[PDB]
Amino acid sequence: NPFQFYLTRVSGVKPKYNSGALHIKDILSPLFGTLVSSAQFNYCFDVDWLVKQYPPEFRKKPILLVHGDKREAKAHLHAQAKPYENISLCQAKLDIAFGTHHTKMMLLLYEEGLRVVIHTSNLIHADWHQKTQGIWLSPLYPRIADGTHKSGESPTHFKADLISYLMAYNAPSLKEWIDVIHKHDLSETNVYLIGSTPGRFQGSQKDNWGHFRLKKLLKDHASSMPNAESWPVVGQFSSVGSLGADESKWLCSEFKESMLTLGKESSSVPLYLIYPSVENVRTSLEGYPAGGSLPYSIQTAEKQNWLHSYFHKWSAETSGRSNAMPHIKTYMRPSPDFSKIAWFLVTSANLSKAAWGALEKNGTQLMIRSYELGVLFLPSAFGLDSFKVKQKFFAGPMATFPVPYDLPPELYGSKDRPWIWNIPYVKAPDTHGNMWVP
Numbered sequence: 001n002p003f004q005f006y007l008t009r010v011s012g013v014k015p016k017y018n019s020g021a022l023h024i025k026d027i028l029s030p031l032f033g034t035l036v037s038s039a040q041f042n043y044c045f046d047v048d049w050l051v052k053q054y055p056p057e058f059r060k061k062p063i064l065l066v067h068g069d070k071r072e073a074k075a076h077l078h079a080q081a082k083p084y085e086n087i088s089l090c091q092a093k094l095d096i097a098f099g100t101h102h103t104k105m106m107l108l109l110y111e112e113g114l115r116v117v118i119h120t121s122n123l124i125h126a127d128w129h130q131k132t133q134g135i136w137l138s139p140l141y142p143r144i145a146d147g148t149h150k151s152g153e154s155p156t157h158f159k160a161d162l163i164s165y166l167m168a169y170n171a172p173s174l175k176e177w178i179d180v181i182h183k184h185d186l187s188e189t190n191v192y193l194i195g196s197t198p199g200r201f202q203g204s205q206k207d208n209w210g211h212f213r214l215k216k217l218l219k220d221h222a223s224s225m226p227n228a229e230s231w232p233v234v235g236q237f238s239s240v241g242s243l244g245a246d247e248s249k250w251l252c253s254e255f256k257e258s259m260l261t262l263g264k265e266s267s268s269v270p271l272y273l274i275y276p277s278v279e280n281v282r283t284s285l286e287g288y289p290a291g292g293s294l295p296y297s298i299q300t301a302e303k304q305n306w307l308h309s310y311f312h313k314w315s316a317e318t319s320g321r322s323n324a325m326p327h328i329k330t331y332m333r334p335s336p337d338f339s340k341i342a343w344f345l346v347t348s349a350n351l352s353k354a355a356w357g358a359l360e361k362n363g364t365q366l367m368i369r370s371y372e373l374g375v376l377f378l379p380s381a382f383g384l385d386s387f388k389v390k391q392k393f394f395a396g397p398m399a400t401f402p403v404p405y406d407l408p409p410e411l412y413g414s415k416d417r418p419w420i421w422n423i424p425y426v427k428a429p430d431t432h433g434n435m436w437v438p
């Protein structure tokens with residue numbers, strides 16, 4: 001494979017379904033590089049657990065934790081990290097209300113070079129235990145020789161785009177990492193960076209972030225095909241924000257319109273949304289506690305029942321993960337028979353205006369509340385017109401993309417309901433014999 005897209009290891013599936021998978025100990029292993037220093041961007045941290053995932057010989061190397069916690073949450077994180085003298089913290093500024101820092105990324109500085117990891121898991125045991133999570137592993141980026149003047153840029157502009165993403169924090173600890181990235185050659189990168197940073201973007205900055213960034217990339221670097229209107233859009237996520245009183249308010253107006261974009265020319269395109277049903281959660285490896293990480297509240301859900309008619313069950317026979325609840329988020333553009341895809345995105349961004357941006361000020365301003373990060377796989381970046389969909393995720397031309405769940409997605413049945421995490425489920429017990437009583 002040239003794609004370097006991986007799933008996390010799942011405890012309890014047969015070895016065939018973990019052979020190509022990565023645990024965090026694998027990512028941090030000396031086999032990937034001799035660690036000098038690392039930055040861990042995330043949302044939730046268990047610092048004691050996290051340090052144990054580094055190899056013992058690397059556990060005292062400097063670690064920067066990049067988080068968005070404030071007030072007592074911030075105090076708790078500092079208290080977690082105080083026992084470890086090698087850990088520094090960077091509080092990402094969140095100057096827009098209800099914003100959060102969801103970006104999940106490792107910067108791994110080695111003796112031998114630099115690696116970037118963009119993924120979907122929190123740095124806590126349960127996010128790596130029995131969930132479906134996604135990982136993109138960059139190549140080993142070599143250092144540019146001192147005195148040599150080259151860009152180290154890729155055809156996808158990844159180096160400049162990653163620096164741009166880090167510059168938005170205005171953070172001194174991240175300027176140090178910007179200087180590290182400047183000194184490395186990222187030219188082999190074949191993915192496009194799609195980030196969200198908090199702010200209100202107009203004019204020349206509108207296209208930098210969120211769903212407008214996606215739109216711009218798809219306009220510039222994808223081709224429209226005949227009967228493009230028949231190629232569905234698939235969104236797959238683990239949380240849902242408040243999208244409005246009907247589909248025209250945001251989902252099908254600006255969000256779907258960005259995702260439909262192909263090529264530079266000026267809708268009945270089917271939209272499949274994949275989100276675990278109650279039954280998916282009940283019968284999962286974790287049982288009802290998997291719903292602890294699917295934080296769709298009844299208060300939000302009751303305001304937008306129109307949305308649930310778009311919902312499809314989680315199903316992942318292709319990767320043996322139908323019972324490993326998703327915390328990965330993915331978006332893609334399959335062909336009408338789901339045999340090909342025009343692009344694939346793995347990201348931290350859930351289906352929310354906070355994550356993707358919402359137009360304001362008469363359509364002239366894109367307001368984003370949160371930090372998010374993902375990578376976009378475009379066929380043009382691999383010298384292809386489309387990706388073939390890999391039939392078995394862990395099977396054996398290497399130019400077929402490993403989609404981690406089943407296509408076509410399966411609509412909710414009439415008795416199915418979306419997992420809603422703050423109501424009780426006491427009709428049927430889960431795989432551990434328990435009910436769900438919040």
Ligand SMILES: O=C(O)c1cnc2c(S(=O)(=O)O)cccc2c1O
Pocket residue numbers: 043044101102120121122292293294295
């Ligand atoms: O991956 C993330 O960044 C993320 C963020 N938030 C979560 C919440 S909640 O803080 O929104 O209540 C509840 C359960 C899981 C969450 C999660 O996985």
